[PDB]
Amino acid sequence: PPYTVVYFPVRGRCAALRMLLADQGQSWKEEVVTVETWQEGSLKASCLYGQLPKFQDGDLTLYQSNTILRHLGRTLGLYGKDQQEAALVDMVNDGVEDLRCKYISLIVTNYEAGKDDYVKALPGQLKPFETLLSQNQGGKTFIVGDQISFADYNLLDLLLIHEVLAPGCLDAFPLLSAYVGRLSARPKLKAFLASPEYVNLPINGNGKQ
Amino acid sequence: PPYTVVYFPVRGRCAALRMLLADQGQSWKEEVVTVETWQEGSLKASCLYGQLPKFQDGDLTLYQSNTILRHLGRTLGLYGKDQQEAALVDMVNDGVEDLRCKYISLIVTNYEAGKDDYVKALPGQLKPFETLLSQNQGGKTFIVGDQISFADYNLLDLLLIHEVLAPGCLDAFPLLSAYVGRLSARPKLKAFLASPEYVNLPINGNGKQ
Ligand SMILES: N[C@H](CCC(=O)N[C@@H](CS)C(=O)NCC(=O)O)C(=O)O
Ligand SMILES: N[C@H](CCC(=O)N[C@@H](CS)C(=O)NCC(=O)O)C(=O)O
Ligand SMILES: C=C(CC)C(=O)c1ccc(OCC(=O)O)c(Cl)c1Cl
Ligand SMILES: C=C(CC)C(=O)c1ccc(OCC(=O)O)c(Cl)c1Cl
Ligand SMILES: [Ca+2]
Ligand SMILES: [Ca+2]
Ligand SMILES: [Ca+2]
Ligand SMILES: [Ca+2]
Ligand SMILES: [Ca+2]
Ligand SMILES: [Ca+2]
Numbered sequence A, B: 001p002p003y004t005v006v007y008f009p010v011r012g013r014c015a016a017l018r019m020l021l022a023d024q025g026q027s028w029k030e031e032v033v034t035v036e037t038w039q040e041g042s043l044k045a046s047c048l049y050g051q052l053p054k055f056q057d058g059d060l061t062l063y064q065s066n067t068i069l070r071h072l073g074r075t076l077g078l079y080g081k082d083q084q085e086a087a088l089v090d091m092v093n094d095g096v097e098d099l100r101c102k103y104i105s106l107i108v109t110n111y112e113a114g115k116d117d118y119v120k121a122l123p124g125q126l127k128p129f130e131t132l133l134s135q136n137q138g139g140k141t142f143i144v145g146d147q148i149s150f151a152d153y154n155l156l157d158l159l160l161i162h163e164v165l166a167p168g169c170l171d172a173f174p175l176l177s178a179y180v181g182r183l184s185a186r187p188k189l190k191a192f193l194a195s196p197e198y199v200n201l202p203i204n205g206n207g208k209q
Helices: A012-023 A035-040 A042-046 A065-075 A083-109 A111-134 A150-165 A174-184 A187-194 B012-023 B035-040 B042-046 B065-076 B083-109 B111-134 B150-165 B174-184 B187-194
Strands: A003-007 A029-032 A054-057 A060-063 B003-007 B028-032 B054-057 B060-063
Touching: A003 A012, A012 A065, A012 A150, A012 A187, A035 A042, A054 A065, A060 A065, A060 B083, A065 A083, A065 A150, A065 B083, A083 A111, A083 A150, A083 B060, A083 B065, A111 A150, A111 A174, A150 A174, A174 A187, B003 B012, B012 B065, B012 B150, B012 B187, B035 B042, B054 B065, B060 B065, B065 B083, B065 B150, B083 B111, B083 B150, B111 B150, B111 B174, B150 B174, B174 B187
Parallel strands: A003 A029, B003 B028
Antiparallel strands: A003 A054, A054 A060, B003 B054, B054 B060
16 A cells, blocks of 8 residues: 555446455545546556556556456455465456456447347356355355455455346345345445445446446 | 366467466376367356366366466466566456457457458557566566566467467567567477477367467
């Protein structure tokens, strides 16, 4: 620290890392980039891959939302107990990323025509995470092992936004459903999720969810 | 170990982890899945996310190409010298993955109509990695720090397939151009890249490159 998040005024790809920081009792600054500022081009030209989020951790500048999550995971001890658990954490996170990419593609490029197909496909996309829970202490703790990892925050966000996209998509998955409630009830995360800094942001940039 | 790679008969998303293993003096088994076996459904239904590669490391079963890379990076010590370098390695790898996804989309969904636009955009997509090299010991070592990392193998693969797609795309990037020659000349990697194991597989599954 100090931590600074540089992003558009949306939840988007910063939603998980923010929940992680909040739940872990961390402070951070939000630096907001508007569409009009971004379009000027100067900040963009300055970004490693021409994209946001950009994250500052003291004198470390990072790009890439999953790099930020892994960095915070490593430095705050949210990466499993073992090298083997570490591997499982990554496997979960990469799964979350794949589905997030499909979600973003729908939202940004094909919402109206694509939604029906996406929703029909959704149970089979959610099922792997229910299966992972079923294989770890009866679904009663976390996605990997017996402590929270960065993948938990990422998966929680993915599940939250899919309940907005498709209300009741978790009803067929008792472990995922209970998991969402149990993690959302963690006191620091509960407060953050109720706070204007979360509540008063849209999920995406184009008005769709 | 022992290591097993379960994949289609292509370089694809196993190309980097295979270079990594060969370069590190590791042996592994290739278990080949044909289009016909895959279409039968049994193996696919058994895969965590319904996809390949699948990787065995002794009694550990992994899915997700970047999970496998990070696992090998972690267990073989190809993950930077400290936590800050680990973050930089992830940042590189996540950048490589974004471009790989764009490349795969071109190849699979839009080769004929998309190639011109893709190739025009290519220098802007390659420049960040030239910049990273320029910022690390004048480009003379590795993408991050002074030791090879899993992201080096993934980046080298990305550069190799783009030279096939767009011959001469690296001519404007002297550090990237030299980096490709230098890593490819590493003795164990050199031998692997010249071997039937590599040479006799197509890059992708649809006859395009
Ligand atoms: N690989 C992604 C990239 C982030 C990304 O897609 N950024 C978008 C908003 S979430 C963006 O900056 N688009 C603006 C532009 O490309 O000009 C990550 O995980 O951070
Ligand atoms: N997230 C990817 C996914 C792998 C993937 O897209 N697999 C393709 C071949 S490279 C596949 O198994 N397609 C068959 C199918 O979906 O049925 C990874 O990094 O491993
Ligand atoms: C957040 C996104 C997906 C999670 C995204 O793709 C995105 C892209 C461009 C954006 O504006 C900048 C512009 O000039 O359009 C905004 Cl606000 C967003 Cl949210
Ligand atoms: C990444 C890929 C290549 C650029 C890819 O998606 C892919 C998908 C299906 C495939 O066949 C199996 C089948 O019958 O679907 C194969 Cl061989 C590949 Cl390589
Ligand atoms: Ca704050
Ligand atoms: Ca912990
Ligand atoms: Ca319910
Ligand atoms: Ca029901
Ligand atoms: Ca090393
Ligand atoms: Ca040249």
